[PDB]
Amino acid sequence: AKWVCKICGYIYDEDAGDPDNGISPGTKFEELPDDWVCPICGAPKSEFEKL
Ligand SMILES: [Fe+3]
């Protein structure tokens, strides 16, 4: 799945993960740490919408 940061437009792609911030590819959004935030704008998970 992809999820979009409603603040900045960043797309969290679960296939890509977010390895620079400790997230391996294939990590589902729901598996992201509570303290993970948009690596662009720092918005919390609450500001993401699933596409
Ligand atoms: Fe953002």
UniProtKB/Swiss-Prot annotation:
Manner of cofactor binding, per the entry note: Binds 1 Fe(3+) ion per subunit.
Record has DNA damage as a keyword: no
A biological-process GO annotation: alkane catabolic process
SUPFAM superfamilies in alphabetical order: Rubredoxin-like
Temperature dependence comment: Extremely thermostable, being unaffected after incubation for 24 hours at 95 degrees Celsius.
One of the record's GO molecular function terms: electron transfer activity
Cross-referenced CDD domains: rubredoxin
Residues that bind Fe cation: C5, C8, C38, C41
Function: Rubredoxin is a small nonheme, iron protein lacking acid-labile sulfide. Its single Fe, chelated to 4 Cys, functions as an electron acceptor and may also stabilize the conformation of the molecule.
Family statement drawn from the similarity comment of this UniProt entry: Belongs to the rubredoxin family.
Name of the protein this chain belongs to: Rubredoxin
Organism of origin: Pyrococcus furiosus (strain ATCC 43587 / DSM 3638 / JCM 8422 / Vc1)
Gene responsible for this protein: rub
